[PDB]
Amino acid sequence: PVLDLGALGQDFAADPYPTYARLRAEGPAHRVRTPEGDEVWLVVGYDRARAVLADPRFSKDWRNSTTPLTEAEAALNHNMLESDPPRHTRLRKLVAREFTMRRVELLRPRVQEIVDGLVDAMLAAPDGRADLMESLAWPLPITVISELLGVPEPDRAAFRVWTDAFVFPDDPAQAQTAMAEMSGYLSRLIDSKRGQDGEDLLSALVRTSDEDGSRLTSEELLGMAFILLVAGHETTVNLIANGMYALLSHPDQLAALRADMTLLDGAVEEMLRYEGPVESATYRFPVEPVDLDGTVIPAGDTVLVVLADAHRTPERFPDPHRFDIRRDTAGHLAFGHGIHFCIGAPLARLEARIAVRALLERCPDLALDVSPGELVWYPNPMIRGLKALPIRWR
Numbered sequence: 001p002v003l004d005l006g007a008l009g010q011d012f013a014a015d016p017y018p019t020y021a022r023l024r025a026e027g028p029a030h031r032v033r034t035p036e037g038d039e040v041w042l043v044v045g046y047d048r049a050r051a052v053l054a055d056p057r058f059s060k061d062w063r064n065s066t067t068p069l070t071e072a073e074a075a076l077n078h079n080m081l082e083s084d085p086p087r088h089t090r091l092r093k094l095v096a097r098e099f100t101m102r103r104v105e106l107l108r109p110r111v112q113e114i115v116d117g118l119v120d121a122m123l124a125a126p127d128g129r130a131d132l133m134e135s136l137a138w139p140l141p142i143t144v145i146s147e148l149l150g151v152p153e154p155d156r157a158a159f160r161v162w163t164d165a166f167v168f169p170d171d172p173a174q175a176q177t178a179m180a181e182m183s184g185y186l187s188r189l190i191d192s193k194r195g196q197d198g199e200d201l202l203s204a205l206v207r208t209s210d211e212d213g214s215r216l217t218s219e220e221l222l223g224m225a226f227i228l229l230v231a232g233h234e235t236t237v238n239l240i241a242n243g244m245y246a247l248l249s250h251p252d253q254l255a256a257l258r259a260d261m262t263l264l265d266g267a268v269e270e271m272l273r274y275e276g277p278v279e280s281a282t283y284r285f286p287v288e289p290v291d292l293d294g295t296v297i298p299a300g301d302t303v304l305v306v307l308a309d310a311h312r313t314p315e316r317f318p319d320p321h322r323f324d325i326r327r328d329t330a331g332h333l334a335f336g337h338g339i340h341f342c343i344g345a346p347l348a349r350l351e352a353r354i355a356v357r358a359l360l361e362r363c364p365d366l367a368l369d370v371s372p373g374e375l376v377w378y379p380n381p382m383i384r385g386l387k388a389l390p391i392r393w394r
Ligand code: HEM
Pocket: 053, 080, 081, 082, 092, 099, 227, 228, 229, 231, 232, 233, 235, 236, 239, 276, 277, 278, 281, 282, 283, 333, 334, 335, 336, 337, 339, 340, 341, 342, 343, 344, 345, 347, 348
């Protein structure tokens, strides 16, 4: 049959794991209907999830999908995440040097400065209370990526409204309108760099496209700006929020980290394992019928690798539902796996590490200012994210 995910309401959005685990008991692949009405395949179970993410039979090029693209969707589609080799290879090579650990490490002073200023403003609240999402989780990643790419400050607010419509639109037409608006804005921003001799990443990309259109077409120039600004926004925002929620709702772990801040890196890894922002990977399309344990997924269908269920597979992560900052987290799929492994992983880790350390060191008696049952989780099947994260201190 086809399991209806939308018929489970906020209960599934808040705690989807028993649903996924139930399906994994029956097999690796399952036809479901998303809360928004999309008929898709779910791939569950760690070993299968990891294998499918790197299986070249599961393409990311939309030319291999039987799902139609709107005009707005197609305009942003020429990007590395929605490509196979050789196009994926050519596109990622253009910006790979920008995101290595060595290069990202040169951003640590600026990231620390951004975090310091945002925490300063948060601590200015007289009642010692704040929404962590608004105070730190949203502004930090959009500030970093905007300075790297060259998005002027007055333009960034509208950018966050758009990506919000991508995840939780009030209706499907609102997602379409935001896509057309972001496409129009990005093309204008690309135009504004032309001939201005800027040294931001977008300025270099415009130059690259202009002097050889076969190395980076104008559609791919637009798609590159788009994917670099969008792919890391909702993810990094929700890693900080989900991770802080994990720390604040497991007080034993918060105390362990407070008493030994060298556990920080291992704690961020477990935040990725336990409550990573990517619940399911982006769309994959079998180039041919693929047999998964007697379940055959036909060519062109939409396949979602449920990363969240892979991280709760007991054979791979023993005692899966325990948030343990000292856990062996090696092999988690929070950044994906294969040729599409997150290009921004060093940057995301840098932002998350600095953000967590700042809160723990500068918010005395930091605590969750609402009950976990009162939190509201967004129902998007790809993103695990909170509506807000009320906190208190002092
Ligand atoms: C906590 C933060 C992040 C998480 C959990 C995350 C997660 C992921 C995942 C799971 C994928 C692969 C998706 C798929 O296979 O379906 C991916 C790819 C990608 N991510 Fe991230 N990401 C994060 C941060 C960032 C940041 C900050 C940037 C911006 C520079 C970024 C840029 C990208 C790009 C461009 C790709 C596509 C790479 C390619 O296809 O080779 N990510 N990310």
